[PDB]
């Protein structure tokens, strides 16, 4: 019923989600002759690459989660809206969303859908009670809560087996996020806490990195994978590969490896970085358009990112199963910019008879292992180590919104890498447990 947005007499663009793709399309429409609505679940534009830093106390929330209203402040075309999209209608041309129990059904003339993707438990979906996967500010603070709270519990225990259980951290998945987390948790336990405890030595903590994949960083090949693994192993991370999780609980994890030697890992704190799963909005799209979903539910968009039959509805970023395009920032940014350019060209009436296919311009990739250690690959060139870690820090630091935010980031890196001192090192029990306990109570 309620449109939940300002009225319009121009071509109406509705953008779903406010991460990279959606925000890039919004910025790209800044002087197009269209009215833009941007509907997203959260006020902030989460700079997910650095999420492991706030998850490990290097950086604050406001360095990585700028308010979208401040970014689009001057863009008179664009109204930002809070809300969770409940449903999308391809025939009535409405987006149906909820906010604190109020329902809004915003009309559109074209869509950019950038709802993205998150981790996947491969159907063992109840594991989310015991092993969160970050990918949001809430989940990153929940992880920071657990990873410090384990040491705080570990001092107050006469039981050595309980201490061993608390001081063993398990990271599942050897994708970029898993190597990042196992790296920072190992640094945190080795160097930041080194003198701050008196019943235990945090340097005796174990960090275990589990994946069923045969190699670390599958998309970067054998050389960079082996070098990253050797760096993690030199840091003392126990890298276990070819081990598939069979069960997860509050006390530990059971894994079965390729030889079938079922075993258990006792481990209080567990991080689930593995897999991918697209936004459920793909289901409503599949039902209305008949578009295919791949495994993990990504929409098999047409060569112009449209749905079959409903042109000028675009799916972009990690929600789209574009052929060969990796699930990385520059893919969302290019997809959103492409869709935006299409809409601008059509509204101005300069549309060609056929839209040229989307071409992903591959601008390379990078992953951090730890302080002074990253890996990179640019076309035929592969490099690793300090020069890489510099080329990562510089690349991300270029993107952070606002000059102050960059400066305070650079100060926080300065101290955290040159000295054994994290900022932001505050647990709150509310944030460490609210999600799991409310899940336990919502019955």
Please identify every residue annotated as catalytic: 180
Binding ligand A1BNR (rule: CB under 6 A), the pick from 164, 215, 391, 434 is 391
Q: Which residue carries 């679940």 as its tokens?
A: 41
**Least separation, in Å, of the C-beta of 54 and ligand FAD?**
10
Q: Where are the alpha helices (DSSP H) in 188-280?
A: 221-234
Binding a copy of itself (rule: CB under 8 A), the pick from 155, 222, 233, 294 is 155
- If one asks whether residue 393 binds ligand A1BNR (CB under 6 A), the answer comes out as no
Contact segment (CB under 6 A) with ligand FAD among 34-42, 98-106, 145-153, 209-217 equals 34-42
For residues 26 and 42, what is the distance between their CA atoms, to the nearest angstrom? 16
- If one asks whether residue 430 binds a copy of itself (CB under 8 A), the answer comes out as yes
Torsion from C-alpha of 49, 329, 273, 430, nearest 10 degrees: 50
Identify whether the C-beta of residue 340 lies closer than 8 Å to the C-beta of residue 15: no
Task: Find, among 255, 293, 291, the residue nearest to 276 by Cα.
Answer: 293
3-state helix, strand, coil in the chain (%, to 5): 40, 25, 40
| Paired tokens of 68 | 């979208």
- If one asks whether residue 10 binds a copy of itself (CB under 8 A), the answer comes out as no
- If one asks whether residue 175 binds ligand A1BNR (CB under 6 A), the answer comes out as no
Contact segment (CB under 8 A) with a copy of itself among 15-23, 192-200, 292-300, 386-394 equals 192-200
Taking the CA of residue 274 as centre, how many other CA atoms within 13 Å lie in the half-sphere pointing to its CB?
Answer: 25
Return all residues near 66 (Cβ < 8 A) that are at least 6 apart. 44, 45, 47, 401, 402, 405
Q: Which does 364 bind (CB under 5 to 8 A by kind): ligand FAD, a copy of itself, ligand A1BNR, none?
A: ligand A1BNR
Q: Which residue carries 């481990």 as its tokens?
A: 267
For residue 368, what is the enclosing H or E element? strand 365-370
Binding ligand FAD (rule: CB under 6 A), the pick from 66, 173, 176, 252 is 176
CA distances to 85, 203, 394 from 158, rounded to whole Å, are 50, 19, 46
Task: Find, among 99, 83, 102, 253, the residue nearest to 168 by Cα.
Answer: 253
Q: Which does 378 bind (CB under 5 to 8 A by kind): ligand FAD, a copy of itself, ligand A1BNR, none?
A: ligand A1BNR
Q: Is the Cβ of residue 193 or residue 220 nearer to ligand A1BNR in the bound state? A: 220
> Helix or strand or coil: residue 205?
coil
Contact segment (CB under 6 A) with ligand A1BNR among 219-227, 283-291, 339-347, 364-372 equals 364-372
Contact segment (CB under 6 A) with ligand A1BNR among 26-34, 169-177, 311-319, 325-333 equals 325-333
Q: Is the Cβ of residue 67 or residue 90 nearer to a copy of itself in the bound state? A: 67
Tell me the per-residue interface mask from 196 to 225 with ligand A1BNR, x by CB under 6 A, - otherwise.
Answer: ------------------------------
Q: Is the Cβ of residue 292 or residue 359 nearer to ligand A1BNR in the bound state? A: 359
Task: Find, among 331, 267, 81, the residue nearest to 339 by Cα.
Answer: 331
- Name the site residues for ligand A1BNR (rule: CB under 6 A): 20, 49, 329-330, 333, 363-366, 376, 378, 391, 395-396, 399
- Name the site residues for ligand FAD (rule: CB under 6 A): 16-21, 39-42, 46, 48-49, 51-52, 84-85, 114-116, 134-135, 176-177, 279, 317-318, 327-329, 332, 367
């Amino acid at each position: 019923s309620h449109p939940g947005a300002t009225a319009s007499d121009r071509h109406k663009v509705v953008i779903i989600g406010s991460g990279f793709g959606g925000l890039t399309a919004a910025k790209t429409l800044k002087r197009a002759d269209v009215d833009v609505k941007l509907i997203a679940r959260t006020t902030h534009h989460l700079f997910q690459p650095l999420l492991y830093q706030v998850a490990t106390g290097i950086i604050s929330e406001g360095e990585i989660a700028p308010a979208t209203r401040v970014i689009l402040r001057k863009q008179k075309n664009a109204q930002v809206l809070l809300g969770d999209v409940t449903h999308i209608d391809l025939e009535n041309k409405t987006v149906d969303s909820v906010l604190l129990g109020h329902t809004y059904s915003t009309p559109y003339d074209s869509l950019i859908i950038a709802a993205g993707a998150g981790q996947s438990y491969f159907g063992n979906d109840h594991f989310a009670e015991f092993a969160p996967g970050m990918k949001s500010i809430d989940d990153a603070l929940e992880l920071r809560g657990r990873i410090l709270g384990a040491f705080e519990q570990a001092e107050r225990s006469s039981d050595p087996v309980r201490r061993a259980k608390l001081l063993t951290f398990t990271v599942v998945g050897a994708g970029p996020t898993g190597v990042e987390m196992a790296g920072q948790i190992a640094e945190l336990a080795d160097q930041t806490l080194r003198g701050s405890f008196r019943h235990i030595d945090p340097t005796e903590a174990r960090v275990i990195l589990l994946d069923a994949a045969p190699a670390v960083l599958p998309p970067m090949g054998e050389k960079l994978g082996k070098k990253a693994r050797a760096r993690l192993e030199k840091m003392g991370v126990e890298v276990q590969l070819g081990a598939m999780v069979t069960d997860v609980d509050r006390n530990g994890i059971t894994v079965k490896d390729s030889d079938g030697t079922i075993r258990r890992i006792e481990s209080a704190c567990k991080v689930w970085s593995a897999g991918v799963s697209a936004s459920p909005l793909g289901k409503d799209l599949a039902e209305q358009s008949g578009v295919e979903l791949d495994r993990a539910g990504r929409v098999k968009v047409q060569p112009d990112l449209t749905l079959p039959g409903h042109p000028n509805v675009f799916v972009v970023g990690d929600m789209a199963a574009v052929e060969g395009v990796p699930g990385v920032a520059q893919g969302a940014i290019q997809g959103g910019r492409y869709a935006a350019k299409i809409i601008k060209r059509e509204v101005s009436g300069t549309s060609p008879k056929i839209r040229t296919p989307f071409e992903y311009f591959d601008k390379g990739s990078m992953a951090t292992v730890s302080r002074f250690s990253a890996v990179a690959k640019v076309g035929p060139v592969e490099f690793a180590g300090f020069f890489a870690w510099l080329c990562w820090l510089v690349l991300h630091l270029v993107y952070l919104v606002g000059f102050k935010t960059k400066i305070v980031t650079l100060l926080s890196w300065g101290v955290t890498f040159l000295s054994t001192k994290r900022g932001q090192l505050t647990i709150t029990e509310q944030q460490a447990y609210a999600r799991t306990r409310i899940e336990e109570l919502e019955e």
